[PDB]
Amino acid sequence: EGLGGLERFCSPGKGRGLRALQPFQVGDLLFSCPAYAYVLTVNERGNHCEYCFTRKEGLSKCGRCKQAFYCNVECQKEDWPMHKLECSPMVVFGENWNPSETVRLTARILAKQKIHPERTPSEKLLAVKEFESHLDKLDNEKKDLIQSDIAALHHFYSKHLGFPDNDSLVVLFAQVNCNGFTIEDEELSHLGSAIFPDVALMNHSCCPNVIVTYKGTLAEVRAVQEIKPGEEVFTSYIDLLYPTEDRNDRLRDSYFFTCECQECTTKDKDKAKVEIRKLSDPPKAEAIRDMVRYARNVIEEFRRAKHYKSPSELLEICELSQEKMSSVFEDSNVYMLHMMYQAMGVCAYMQDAEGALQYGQKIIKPYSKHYPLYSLNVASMWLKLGRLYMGLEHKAAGEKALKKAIAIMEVAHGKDHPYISEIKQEIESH
Amino acid sequence: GLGGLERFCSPGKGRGLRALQPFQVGDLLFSCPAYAYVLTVNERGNHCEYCFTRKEGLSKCGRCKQAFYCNVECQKEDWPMHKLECSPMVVFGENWNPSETVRLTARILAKQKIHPERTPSEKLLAVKEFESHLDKLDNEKKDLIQSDIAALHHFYSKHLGFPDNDSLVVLFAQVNCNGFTIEDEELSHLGSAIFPDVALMNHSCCPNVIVTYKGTLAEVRAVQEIKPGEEVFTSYIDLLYPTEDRNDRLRDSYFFTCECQECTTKDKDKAKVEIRKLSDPPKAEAIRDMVRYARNVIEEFRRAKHYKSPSELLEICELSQEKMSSVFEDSNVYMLHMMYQAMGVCAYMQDAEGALQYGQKIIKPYSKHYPLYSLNVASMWLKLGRLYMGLEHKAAGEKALKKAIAIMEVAHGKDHPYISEIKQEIESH
Ligand SMILES: Nc1ncnc2c1ncn2[C@@H]1O[C@H](CSCC[C@H](N)C(=O)O)[C@@H](O)[C@H]1O
Ligand SMILES: Nc1ncnc2c1ncn2[C@@H]1O[C@H](CSCC[C@H](N)C(=O)O)[C@@H](O)[C@H]1O
Ligand SMILES: [Zn+2]
Ligand SMILES: [Zn+2]
Ligand SMILES: [Zn+2]
Ligand SMILES: [Zn+2]
Ligand SMILES: [Zn+2]
Ligand SMILES: [Zn+2]
């Protein structure tokens, strides 16, 4: 059928999209869409159920592989048609079993089509076969990364899968890299990847009118602005903190397009985001271009460093970069804030909560002013800063920060969402 | 309808343009703004994308950095067309290389979607009415148009509403027949455009008007005496080559055979295929062999420029000129063509002394094979002129430049900007 209040249409310049037929207010559920295929990330095993993504302590372990946990035998046998793709190879390959998460998700996509080749209730407006691939635009270096995924697919998932032509496998991974979703928790921590066909129909905008939240394996779409009949439903694919140039670089790299919304054409927030300190002698333009290029490099340098460097060395990257940037950038600069945010996360892992709160409170005020009204990046930041206070018995500034997240999350997740209950339950704990 | 001219059906040539009032040599028949246009890739940074203004120091486009404008005025004025390529040029990167015909065709579809009514550029012949010569398309020729439709969907599928593939075949066929290539004062390629009213004029190897450009505006000026009732004729091809070579391009590219005075009588075919009668007169078959050889090496040099070094291109000319000099006189148009190519290669190596030695040899016989007012002769005088100005040979330099002014003042007009800059080159001491 068709989702009530919404209609599929061809947006001029954006291919296909989702358009509203009835008015939607801030907080209204536009539609819900169950996952077509989904996988729990490796680092969250034991904390969430494999079948329904229920976070709970004490989960029944899988007898054969011991690396898959369920709430009970109910969720176990329900997940077996998909778990059988990995249960046996995880023990046979042992340490050598390490497929990418995109390959894990793709292997279950092929499995779902094999045991359910007709339209699922997850694709009432956009079938999985209709996913745009951008195959024409794949760079040669990008083509080897997709071929390396097909090689791992045959390497790990050859037991239960009937593989189509290699041409059909290249286009399948291309669609997954464009239409794939990453499930996140309340703290915006990575929980897994999934495919939501009807949700993938919505286009991108740096000033979106809806935000996507998750209730286990079910994706919920809720309006973050006022949506009138005839207006297209827009979401955000990327982190809206960085300037127009940085945003469109991720968009062109990962999705093969350049955003042309109000923010991207006028560069309104580019002044406040690339904020410069107006000392007596204003920094020359070349001194600004050098620091911005320096800031983007060290941000990518920190991403590689986390994979193999000690926490004390990751904190040294932040404190060194902050010194070099503080000569030109004000503390409200998004690059200064990013490094300070990474330093806050490293302190939270070393359980130096006092040091993380000094970073969290410093950045929270300038952080929120660069985001939309109801943003999950701001809500999760208030949650992280909130729960750190509750562990140090600072329940004054703790519940004050938690109510800020609840205010934003009640619009994004909804008032009945389970995340809203647990945060209220954390303020009740005396 | 344009005053002084009328659209009519020429017997044997479909439709054409006919004059109603007398026109003197140099009179502007009409002017026509471009319907769709595109700047060639190799002239970016030298000319504005919107108005083809040649100027140093052009504002670069922030998003793609591969599109230059005079100012933000011309930038946003070209945005309804530039947005078709701005984003894909960065996304595709190195792999973005559509043919210029596809670039121009993609902008035609953009113009018709935001302006489906009659434009002031089609006061006598609409774009929909362009002849297609679809019946005459060879099956192998159909593969080049299908290869262009494939690239059209491949590169311009984001902002374009594509009709049926049948409607796309007929569209590219119209572009290949009615398309124009904008040239500068040296007849160097600046881009492609569509001038509907200008495309109405038929071809003749002795034309009465010549088409010049003032930025993106095409200007038509008479090169002969035009009486009321006479059809307005232009030239589609380079009038240097013999009748057989000329009509081969016409049947290949425009699917017709010219039947003007030159083609029916072959008057200049004797002087163009001039043969030197040494003591033992060259055999008749030896002429057919050298002519076929000369036409082959001309196409052989055409492929070589795309991937061979300039020092190797000069070896192709000097080798062919030696073999041809046994039968052909130095005034032969085939000898002149290779010498013209050698002159251009020497000018790229900045060996202007070596290029001037070729230029002076060919300039006098070159002009005698062309009409009185021909841009091919004007541009040749311009290249020879400014080459002297770089070597401080301003005597023979301004003397060669005054020859271009004589021809260009009739073709381009006395108010044309090209006439001002060359006068500024003689005034610069
Ligand atoms: N704001 C935007 N402007 C132009 N293209 C956009 C866009 N937002 C999304 N897209 C396009 O949509 C793709 C994301 S998947 C979203 C659905 C897609 N339009 C479809 O119907 O298949 C991207 O590859 C991008 O090319
Ligand atoms: N001298 C000539 N003799 C015969 N046909 C000619 C011609 N010059 C042009 N043509 C014809 O006209 C086409 C050129 S495009 C210009 C206009 C065409 N008469 C029209 O109907 O709109 C050629 O491709 C050929 O079909
Ligand atoms: Zn469960
Ligand atoms: Zn198992
Ligand atoms: Zn944007
Ligand atoms: Zn301009
Ligand atoms: Zn651009
Ligand atoms: Zn002729």
Residue numbers in the entry:
A (entry chain A): 4 to 433
B (entry chain B): 5 to 433
Manuscript excerpt for this entry:
Here, we present the discovery of a promiscuous allosteric site in SMYD2, a unique member of the protein lysine methyltransferase family characterized by the co-presence of the SET and MYND domains. SMYD2 is a critical regulator of numerous cellular processes, methylating both histone and non-histone proteins to control chromatin remodeling, DNA damage response, cell cycle progression, cell differentiation, cell survival, and inflammation. We have determined four crystal structures of SMYD2, including a wild-type protein structure in complex with a PARP1 peptide, a wild-type protein structure in complex with an ethylene glycol polymer (PEG), and two structures of SMYD2 mutants. In all structures, SMYD2 maintains a bilobal fold, with the N- and C-lobes displaying a similar orientation and a similar degree of opening.
